[PDB]
Amino acid sequence: RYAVASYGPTDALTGQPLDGKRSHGGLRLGEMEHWVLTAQGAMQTIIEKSHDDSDGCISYICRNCGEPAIYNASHPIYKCMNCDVQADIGMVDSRRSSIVFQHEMRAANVNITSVLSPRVFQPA
Amino acid sequence: EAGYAEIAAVQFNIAGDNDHKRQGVMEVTISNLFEGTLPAEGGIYDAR
Amino acid sequence: MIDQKIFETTLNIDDPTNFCTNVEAHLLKELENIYVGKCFKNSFILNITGVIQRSPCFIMRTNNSGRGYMHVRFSAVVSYLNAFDLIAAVKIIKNDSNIILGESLLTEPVTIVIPSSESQNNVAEVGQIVPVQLANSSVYYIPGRQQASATGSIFIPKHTFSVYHVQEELTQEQALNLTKLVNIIEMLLESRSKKDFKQICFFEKLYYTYSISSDEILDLKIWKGPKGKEMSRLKPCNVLSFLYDALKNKNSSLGFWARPPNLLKSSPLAYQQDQNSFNATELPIICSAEVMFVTLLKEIINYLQFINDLCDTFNNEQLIKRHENIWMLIEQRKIGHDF
Amino acid sequence: IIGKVAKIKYIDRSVMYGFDEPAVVDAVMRPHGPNDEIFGLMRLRYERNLNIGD
Amino acid sequence: AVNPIYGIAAPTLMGSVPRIGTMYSDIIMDEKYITENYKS
Amino acid sequence: SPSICEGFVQASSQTLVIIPDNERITSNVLTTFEATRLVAVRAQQLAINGSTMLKKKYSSPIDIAKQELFNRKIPLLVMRCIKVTPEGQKIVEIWNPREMGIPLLD
């Protein structure tokens, strides 16, 4: 028998709960469970469990260069270390293990650039 | 002030010297890990 | 200066049902609350002229917040400072050994940090209001900040000048383009004409490159120039008249154009010749009528703005005497009539 | 269930009982390890009847 | 290589959610119905 | 010699082209996905505001949203993105759930 609530121990690197009952962590919705929830079309459940309950976070990316930016609302920081005057930061919903994944790819000299979805405008 | 966005594509490339020198926020100069309670400034553990 | 700029942003709506009851008013309110008085995309925002173009209120898709977002393309009145511009009022607030920190008064909020040299720390003090000269591209508009940082130098009028060789005619449509600058000069002149004669006269006497023995520097309605012993056999030409004539295509704009320091910087006068007889220390620059006219018009606007701002700042003579030390520091840099 | 203090003033490396059903301390002892050091040894007992799910 | 984001695995590795099922169609707010039926 | 961000140009902004009502090709019946999404979005936005034109009173956002969909009072529109032209347009179809068939959501 096991049950957790919304909070508890968290892994240092990925930011996800620990592994199971022994570590007082969470239980796993593995790869095959996302296949089933995608087959059902249950996307708002995937946000709730894999983002709001596992390791979701907010990533900031500059429009003009596609690189990660630095944004802090309180203690106002709004800057890109690649433009510094043409910074156009948009917040993308991400999860921490993916940001760790992109830093692990950049650490191996593979540059990751994120093209954001363009602005759309009604005519006139 | 940061508006809502979604990633539409990802471009893969090879990172050179200029990319590292422009993305990097500091330069590792010393091999001291901790001056005290706080991490050493200029080491590999720097708070930057 | 001050002009229009078109910006694109994405606004987050925390309550779409309320926001959509009046999209125009709420959109103007949020743009004003976010962008007015801040730096964004190499510019400083002053006013929100309007919303050119917007998108529907989309519901955010990557989280379960139920919140909205809207893409806005809007037009805003902004103020971009040029390289080596000339501000008339700054209150030095910090005078340390390392740098000097002051803030502009008349213009929009600007922080000016003069690197401290050994010849500067012993003069400028806290509480003084002085004019400053800017530098090249040092006006970085770091986004989100309430001021434009820029390094500057305490202004002393120069003794040199530039000469432009124009070999292409000023066309009619480019004259239509410069009509805006001409109109700006007209508004600056009609705004200056209200001021007291003594203040404008004293400021001009202080900032004129040479010295003149009184009552010989200003003819407001005609701008006949200074009557000093007819130094040049050729009368300086009014820029506005030449532009209005080139509108009707009666004159040619070819040759060498120069504005020697003896000329009044704030007046629309200038020197044109068919042969390079100007006593310049630097080589003339070969350029078209467009570049030369733009540069001359911009210099005229800058110096008219400088005189207007100087006259506005010092409305009383007591403050003039309080800042007389700067006036004499300017004065010792003048060139006498030993020629 | 085991108190523990550590001189550096102190940091609390105590031990908490993280199980859903309450136990009872059956036997506790302070024996010596291989390096002749006192370590805490607690035996926890549970009164287990047959129940639904066994 | 430019990699457009589509399908399941590309958005999942980028930390986003697939545009699939309930997220295939975009919802926008009916302005013309709210200005004539609701009040601020 | 340069950085990747040098030659990077951000995706140009798009114009929203809206197919006129008589040339719409998609179905005038909500899919189960679209009805589920409309009710979910409306329920969360009722958790935010609570302002609704539904005549009967309910104690849950989900019940209010379901009855607003069923009774054709839900203040949302369905945007079906048909194509993104490489000249810079986004051709979409706007569908009004107040005027469409509602699937069987038992």
Ligand SMILES: [Zn+2]
């Ligand atoms: Zn950038």
